[PDB]
């Protein structure tokens, strides 16, 4: 048979007949549920550590592992990703991967809105999630190897890995448009982002499904690494807890918002370029292979920091990096009827939401912009909703169906144009009243729900402006017009760019 049918009873029983007979040593075995899979991944210390303490006994329990047929790599799992070909995963991965907390990445659109205006763009974060799991991997392996000096080990790779995979767990329907336009529509008391949920819900996944115990299992130490994991997720003498200002480097490769050069970016990068058909210039592989660890000391008293650096000479390869980065922001992310999809979407869910039922743990019932507090609820809110609205039989949604069935049909808001501020820009506070000044601003009357207005924000590494654009709801010629000349009037009177 295989390890991987035996239940901790079995391994109990071949590790007795196998002359381990002592009842302490298989109450160990029994008590941590160490299922037949996880044997070939024990370690002399592991057997120290859950309490064998027999310096030879451990030797030959390990030796009675490596008798068996199968092997540590005989466990590992491949996937097959068109952007980054075969894939291994350390079965940790996999029991992570294999919940519903993270399957439920399977129905989130990763570009929104986008799919309706870019066809190709049908992907999900489930496949994102995987492959910056793996380039996360790719790029700890490679500083592994190449600096040896730097102790990084199994467990730090794994945590490594698993920031990568949960760093998207926390998104919500429609991706970017759930944390960045209804939420802080629909709860603007509460700040929140996708990070927040993902780690609250990477907590909500371990615990669920009782995987604190299966880390321990394979060499994860629970209370360390999940601080750490994390932490790689989310962010902040030494801030943080997880690991070692000796290690500082680690928190640059999921999440660097420093500098903007992670693998999640380059794997989002690429795929959406494979997705809406666009070539991509950066090539990452040739990141990783010049990828380096080196100090940098900044005075502020003198700090002396590990980085991640690259060979001075491959610059050249961050300029199509970041080419590729303006290229997709140009042409896909900021794209103008994207948006109005990802506004129609949020305008309904906000019609929506007081009626919508979502019940969490306890059965306690949540709406759909307060699911974020309760994991069991957020888990099961997903695009799908847009069609449970869509085909919901109850009378209150109508209102908010109708806006879903505009934008199958086609029927959205029309896009009066962009405009540019010359000098200054506009207060985050100021947004608010932008849709009455429109709606005043005149050359029939226009109310200040007729139009939205939507501000967009265009926005180191070491080696060794605003686009307001406005929609009118009013879908006639004449309210057109009207709206037309309202907004070229707002954009003449605040001294903006004459509209596109
Ligand atoms: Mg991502």
Same mark, same amino acid.
């Given at each position: 048979?295989?390890?991987?049918?035996?239940?901790?009873?079995?391994?109990?029983?071949?590790?007795?007949?196998?002359? %381990?007979?002592?009842?302490?040593?298989?109450?160990?075995?029994?008590?941590?549920? @160490?299922?037949?899979?996880?044997?070939? %991944?024990?370690?002399?210390?592991?057997?120290?550590?859950?309490?064998?303490?027999?310096?030879?006994?451990?030797?030959?329990?390990?030796?009675?592992?490596?008798?068996?047929?199968?092997?540590?790599?005989?466990?590992?799992?491949?996937?097959?990703?068109?952007?980054?070909?075969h894939?291994?995963?350390?079965?940790?991965?996999?029991?992570?991967?294999?919940?519903?907390?993270?399957?439920?990445?399977?129905y989130?659109?990763?570009?929104?809105?986008?799919?309706?205006?870019?066809?190709?763009?049908?992907?999900?974060?489930?496949?994102?999630?995987?492959?910056?799991?793996?380039?996360?991997?790719?790029?700890?392996?490679?500083?592994?190897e190449?600096q040896?000096?730097?102790?990084?080990?199994?467990?730090?790779?794994?945590?490594?890995?698993?920031?990568?995979?949960?760093?998207?767990?926390?998104?919500?329907?429609?991706?970017?448009?759930? #944390?960045?336009?209804?939420?802080?529509?629909?709860?603007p008391?509460?700040?929140?982002?996708?990070?927040?949920?993902?780690?609250?819900? %990477?907590?909500?996944?371990?615990?669920?499904?009782?995987?604190?115990?299966?880390?321990?299992?394979?060499?994860?130490?629970?209370?360390?690494?999940?601080?750490?994991?994390?932490?790689?997720?989310?962010?902040?003498?030494?801030?943080?807890?997880?690991?070692?200002?000796?290690?500082?480097?680690?928190?640059?490769?999921?999440?660097?918002?420093?500098?903007? @050069?992670?693998?999640?970016?380059?794997?989002?990068?690429?795929?959406?370029?494979?997705?809406?058909?666009?070539?991509?210039?950066?090539?990452?592989?040739? %990141?990783?292979?010049?990828?380096?660890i080196?100090?940098?000391?900044?005075?502020?008293?003198?700090?002396?920091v590990?980085?991640?650096?690259?060979?001075?000479?491959?610059?050249?390869?961050?300029? #199509?990096?970041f080419?590729?980065?303006?290229?997709?922001?140009?042409?896909?992310?900021?794209?103008?009827?994207?948006?109005?999809?990802?506004?129609?979407?949020?305008?309904?869910?906000?019609?929506?939401?007081?009626?919508?039922?979502?019940?969490?743990?306890?059965?306690?019932?949540?709406?759909?912009?307060?699911?974020?507090?309760?994991?069991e609820?957020?888990?099961?809110?997903?695009?799908?909703?847009?069609?449970?609205?869509?085909h919901?039989?109850?009378?209150?949604?109508?209102?908010?169906?109708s806006?879903?069935?505009?934008?199958?049909?086609?029927?959205?808001?029309?896009?009066?144009?962009?405009?540019?501020?010359?000098?200054?820009?506009?207060?985050?506070?100021?947004?608010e009243?932008?849709?009455?000044?429109?709606?005043?601003?005149?050359?029939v009357?226009?109310?200040?729900? #007729?139009?939205?207005?939507?501000?967009?924000?265009?926005?180191?590494?070491?080696?060794?402006?605003?686009?307001?654009?406005?929609?009118?709801?009013?879908?006639?010629?004449?309210?057109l017009?009207?709206?037309?000349?309202?907004?070229?009037?707002?954009c003449?009177?605040?001294?903006?760019?004459?509209?596109?």
């Open positions: 048979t295989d390890l991987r049918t035996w239940e901790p009873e079995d391994v109990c029983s071949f590790l007795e007949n196998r002359g %381990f007979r002592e009842k302490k040593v298989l109450d160990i075995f029994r008590d941590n549920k @160490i299922a037949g899979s996880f044997l070939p %991944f024990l370690d002399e210390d592991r057997l120290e550590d859950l309490g064998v303490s027999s310096l030879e006994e451990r030797k030959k329990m390990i030796e009675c592992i490596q008798q068996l047929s199968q092997s540590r790599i005989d466990l590992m799992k491949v996937f097959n990703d068109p952007i980054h070909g894939i291994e995963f350390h079965p940790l991965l996999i029991r992570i991967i294999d919940t519903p907390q993270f399957q439920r990445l399977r989130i659109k990763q570009l929104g809105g986008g799919y309706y205006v870019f066809p190709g763009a049908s992907h999900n974060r489930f496949e994102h999630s995987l492959g910056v799991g793996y380039l996360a991997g790719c790029l700890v392996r490679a500083l592994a190449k040896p000096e730097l102790q990084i080990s199994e467990r730090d790779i794994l945590c490594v890995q698993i920031a990568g995979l949960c760093h998207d767990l926390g998104h919500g329907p429609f991706s970017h448009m759930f #944390d960045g336009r209804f939420i802080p529509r629909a709860r008391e509460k700040k929140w982002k996708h990070e927040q949920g993902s780690i609250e819900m %990477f907590e909500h996944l371990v615990n669920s499904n009782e995987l604190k115990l299966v880390m321990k299992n394979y060499g994860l130490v629970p209370e360390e690494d999940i601080t750490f994991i994390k932490e790689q997720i989310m962010g902040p003498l030494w801030p943080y807890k997880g690991r070692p200002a000796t290690k500082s480097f680690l928190y640059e490769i999921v999440s660097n918002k420093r500098n903007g @050069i992670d693998v999640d970016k380059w794997d989002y990068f690429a795929r959406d370029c494979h997705h809406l058909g666009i070539q991509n210039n950066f090539d990452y592989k040739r %990141f990783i292979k010049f990828a380096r080196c100090e940098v000391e900044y005075k502020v008293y003198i700090r002396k590990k980085h991640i650096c690259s060979r001075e000479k491959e610059v050249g390869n961050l300029y #199509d990096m080419h590729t980065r303006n290229c997709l922001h140009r042409r896909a992310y900021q794209h103008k009827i994207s948006n109005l999809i990802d506004i129609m979407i949020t305008d309904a869910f906000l019609k929506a939401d007081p009626y919508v039922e979502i019940t969490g743990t306890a059965g306690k019932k949540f709406r759909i912009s307060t699911a974020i507090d309760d994991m609820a957020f888990t099961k809110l997903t695009d799908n909703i847009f069609l449970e609205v869509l919901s039989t109850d009378p209150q949604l109508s209102e908010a169906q806006i879903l069935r505009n934008i199958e049909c086609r029927n959205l808001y029309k896009y009066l144009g962009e405009t540019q501020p010359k000098r200054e820009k506009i207060r985050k506070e100021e947004y009243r932008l849709p009455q000044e429109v709606a005043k601003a005149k050359p009357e226009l109310k200040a729900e #007729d139009f939205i207005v939507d501000v967009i924000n265009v926005d180191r590494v070491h080696f060794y402006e605003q686009l307001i654009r406005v929609y009118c709801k009013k879908k006639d010629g004449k309210s017009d009207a709206a037309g000349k309202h907004f070229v009037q707002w003449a009177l605040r001294d903006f760019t004459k509209p596109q």
